[PDB]
Write a protein that binds this ligand. Structure first.
Ligand SMILES: *[C@@H]1O[C@H](CO)[C@@H](O)[C@H](O)[C@H]1NC(C)=O
Ligand SMILES: *[C@@H]1O[C@H](CO)[C@@H](O)[C@H](O)[C@H]1NC(C)=O
Ligand SMILES: *[C@@H]1O[C@H](CO)[C@@H](O)[C@H](O)[C@H]1NC(C)=O
Ligand SMILES: *[C@@H]1O[C@H](CO)[C@@H](O)[C@H](O)[C@H]1NC(C)=O
Ligand SMILES: *[C@@H]1O[C@H](CO)[C@@H](O)[C@H](O)[C@H]1NC(C)=O
Ligand SMILES: *[C@@H]1O[C@H](CO)[C@@H](O)[C@H](O)[C@H]1NC(C)=O
Ligand SMILES: *[C@@H]1O[C@H](CO)[C@@H](O)[C@H](O)[C@H]1NC(C)=O
Lengths: 363, 247, 119, 99
């Protein structure tokens, strides 16, 4: 094919180039440090009330949804829009976390579509909500046997208002057309309901810290991403390395090149990447491509036979009978201890021939 | 609130040559036994650097064209920071580096800096809207010894690069830039890019012997030899002498 | 469906000012989000600025960071647009589009839009 | 076919938008000629012209040389409308307005 002829004469011909292909896809991205303050929404003070539910502009950070785990036995991981998992491969331009404590007897009310009395007069969730809703009991740290009135909510309301807005206006209420106008008596009470959390109460109406995470996405660039790959480091093999800005293929090993605290990469005479530094774990490696060379086919001639010998220039018979010479690794010939005239020159004083069955020899 | 000190006149400065000093690392690449040719902003060898001496309050505003080589032969840490700005009118952003008791604080703001700043920071009174703040705890710092502090301030493609070098020097005959190689290492690469045209220093007067050698950088091609351990040992100016250009 | 209108100016000198007002009604605006999307004559669409209804955080484009500011009036259910330092290459018909954050990247409703040319 | 005046640019190899992604997409190796002409006197009348339809919402971008004549309802949210054409169930084919 390389000679463009069906009759190959006697001699050595280099056809193509042999090169080992990589196996893995190691990335080794640095240890993120700009984490998002998710501890001031969950591990903050007791909680915020449901009539003044607050939320901060959680944007321009790297929010790892794995730090939310390793806590109290939070059950009811009911999230809509996206699966409970696979959040680490998406980036929303903004996240809003709501913190409010209501009764746990009918926590099913906090969901897209479901309505009632708690999720109507206090905080309603629209039918379209791709966030994540979670809940957990906190009676062990948010209760006391005197009567717990540190959390209030609403009972008196006329109709259902718009969604996603705080309700802090507590003006006088009217159940009908009675012109009360500031009496503060019967049928004209003050619109403010209170709670009573006691450890003696059952699991039904005990306090439950609930948190919803609304993932808002706009035409602005994505800011709140998740963690990156950060794959394991496997050396002593040709790998596709995918470092911060130095991508390529090559083998990695332990290097004795003592780098400097500010230096991160390393070049050579050919202006090629020779050594690198693993960002998360300070360790100097040495990027070296795997074995490669040229394949040469020794043929005694198509007129007399069809057997061939393969010589890989620049190998060590450890990456492809075989014979290791100073020019590579000859495969297809038998090293005879005799010495004849050089018929097919191979190199380093070694030549080949087709002598007597019939087989290719190297001497 | 600032206050203009009394009994302060002007003094004509002097000039002295730089004995092959002011060579930093161009990039963050490790190399050994390599003779690399760089075309970055360096300090030309044997350049007339100023000799601002204080023993007495020398703090003039100096132009910042393309780079500043700031040397300090001190023993008691007389200077404690710098100020960079294009107009010094409390209108645009300006950089300030001030040395604390245990840290270095760098601000990008338009504080009410007065004509004669001097050092608890009584140089300004108020603080406008700032864009960048950086507190670096490791700051920047036996009788017959002295401290030599080298600094290279550059402002190209926005990033204000700050290189530093600390060394002990022996008290010799009247002070000047000693002979030898320094190889200043990259220290600060602030996310900045506000325009900077002029600069000044910051003294420290503790009311109950220093000198700086501000120089100017310019485009020049240098030949740097990297040693086997990854540091630069010598440098060729390539534009100093026929021998320097034939080597 | 339900759709409303937007009014304002139609021509402004290169250096003046203009106040565009997209007037909406009978819609769930406070939990939705609004945005302006321009269209250069002979070119495609370009997102100018956007405001949310949840927290009210605004996001502008990199070319109009210090020249365009908007504010949504929830009492009147209208969206304002006060343009400052009008150059000569900013002529485009601004569209008033609102969408829901808990959805896809497709605009729900599109306004009428009006072309404003600068000398 | 018939498009808008400002939408004539999207009929080109590489150009994207609303008509070139949901109605008619041209390949990058398009070896042909596009010829457009205004029809304000033959396709417009002063009564309210709504006899030209176009698709606005689609799941994915339309591949080059593909005709989509289906009438499957779209879902802008996560609610299973199961064919009701209401809130978050916008109709995929809307009509033009030529005056
Ligand atoms: C809260 O504290 C727990 C226990 O220290 C910790 O595991 C968790 O990551 C913290 N963060 C949150 C979710 O607030
Ligand atoms: C990266 O994080 C890992 C896990 O805590 C830690 O062991 C490693 O030392 C960190 N590396 C640095 C220095 O950033
Ligand atoms: C080939 O491998 C053997 C065993 O590791 C080693 O002794 C020899 O020096 C190697 N030769 C070359 C050419 O690298
Ligand atoms: C520096 O300037 C002074 C005054 O102009 C001059 O006397 C001296 O020779 C100059 N030295 C150099 C290195 O040019
Ligand atoms: C000095 O250090 C303290 C502690 O970090 C800091 O609060 C103060 O701002 C610093 N002073 C200066 C010089 O800004
Ligand atoms: C900071 O204040 C100055 C003076 O009012 C102003 O010119 C500049 O734009 C302000 N920058 C910020 C961060 O808003
Ligand atoms: C480099 O380090 C080696 C080992 O410590 C040492 O023998 C050699 O002299 C050093 N070279 C210099 C002076 O950088």
């Amino acid at each position: 094919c390389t000679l463009k002829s069906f009759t190959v004469e006697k001699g050595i011909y280099q056809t193509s180039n042999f090169r080992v292909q990589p196996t893995e896809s190691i990335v080794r991205f640095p240890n993120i440090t700009n984490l998002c303050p998710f501890d001031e929404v969950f591990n903050a003070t007791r909680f915020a009330s449901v009539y003044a539910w607050n939320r901060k502009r959680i944007s321009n950070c790297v929010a790892d949804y794995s730090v939310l785990y390793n806590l109290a036995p939070f059950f009811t991981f009911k999230c809509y829009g996206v699966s409970p998992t696979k959040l680490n491969d998406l980036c929303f331009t903004n996240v809003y976390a709501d913190s409010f404590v209501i009764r746990g007897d009918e926590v099913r009310q906090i969901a897209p579509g479901q309505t009632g009395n708690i999720a109507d007069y206090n905080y309603k969730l629209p039918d379209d909500f791709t966030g994540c809703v979670i809940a957990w009991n906190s009676n062990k740290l948010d209760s006391k046997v005197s009567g717990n009135y540190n959390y209030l909510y609403r009972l008196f309301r006329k109709s259902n208002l718009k969604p996603f807005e705080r309700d802090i206006s507590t003006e006088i209420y009217q159940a009908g057309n009675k012109p009360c106008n500031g009496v503060a008596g019967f049928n004209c009470y003050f619109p403010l309901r209170s709670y009573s959390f006691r450890p003696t109460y059952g699991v039904g109406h005990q306090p439950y810290r609930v948190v919803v995470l609304s993932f808002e996405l706009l035409h602005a660039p994505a800011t709140v991403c998740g963690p990156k790959k950060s794959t394991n480091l496997v050396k002593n093999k040709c790998v596709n390395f995918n470092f911060n800005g130095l991508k390529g293929t090559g083998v990695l090993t332990e290097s004795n090149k003592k780098f400097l605290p500010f230096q991160q990469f390393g070049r050579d005479i050919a202006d090629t990447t020779d050594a690198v530094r693993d960002p998360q774990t300070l360790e100097i490696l040495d990027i070296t491509p795997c074995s490669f060379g040229g394949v040469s086919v020794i043929t005694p001639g198509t007129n007399t036979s069809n057997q061939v010998a393969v010589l890989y220039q620049g190998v060590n018979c450890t990456e492809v009978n075989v014979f290791q010479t100073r020019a590579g690794c000859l495969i297809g010939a038998e090293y005879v201890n005799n010495s004849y005239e050089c018929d097919i020159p191979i190199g380093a004083g070694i030549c080949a021939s087709y002598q007597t069955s019939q087989s290719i020899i190297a001497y | 609130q600032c206050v203009n000190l009394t009994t302060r006149t002007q003094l004509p400065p002097a000039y002295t040559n730089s004995f092959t000093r002011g060579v930093y690392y161009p990039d963050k690449v490790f190399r050994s036994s390599v003779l690399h040719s760089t075309q970055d902003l360096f300090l030309p060898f044997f350049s007339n650097v100023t000799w601002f001496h204080v023993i007495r309050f020398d703090n003039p505003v100096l132009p910042f064209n393309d780079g500043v080589y700031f040397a300090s032969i001190e023993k008691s840490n007389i200077i404690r920071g710098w100020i960079f700005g294009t107009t010094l009118d409390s209108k645009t952003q300006s950089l300030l580096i001030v040395n604390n008791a245990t840290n270095v604080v760098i601000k990008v703001c338009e504080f009410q800096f007065c004509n004669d700043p001097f050092l608890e920071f009584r140089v300004y009174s108020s603080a406008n809207n700032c864009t960048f703040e950086y507190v670096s705890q490791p700051f920047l710092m036996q009788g017959n010894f002295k401290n030599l502090r080298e600094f290279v301030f550059k402002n190209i493609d926005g990033y204000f690069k700050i290189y530093s070098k600390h060394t002990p020097i022996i008290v010799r005959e009247p002070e000047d830039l000693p002979q030898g190689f320094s190889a200043l290492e990259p220290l600060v690469d602030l996310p900045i890019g506000i325009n900077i045209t002029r600069f000044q220093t910051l003294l420290a007067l503790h009311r109950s012997a220093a000198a700086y050698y501000v120089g100017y950088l310019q485009p020049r091609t240098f030949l740097l030899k990297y040693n086997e351990n990854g540091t630069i040992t010598d440098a060729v100016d390539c534009a100093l002498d026929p021998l320097s250009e034939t080597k | 469906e339900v759709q409303l209108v937007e009014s304002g100016g139609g021509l402004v000198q290169p250096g003046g000012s203009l106040r565009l007002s997209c007037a909406a009604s009978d819609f769930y605006f406070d939990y939705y989000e609004m945005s302006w999307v321009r269209q250069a004559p002979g070119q495609g669409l370009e997102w100018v600025s956007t405001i949310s209804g949840l927290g009210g955080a605004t996001y502008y484009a990199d070319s109009v960071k210090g020249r365009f500011t908007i504010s949504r009036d929830n009492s009147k259910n209208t969206l304002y647009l006060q343009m400052n330092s009008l150059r000569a290459e900013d002529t485009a018909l601004y569209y008033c589009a609102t969408r829901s954050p808990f959805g896809d990247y497709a605009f729900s409703y599109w306004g009428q839009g009006t072309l404003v040319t600068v000398s």
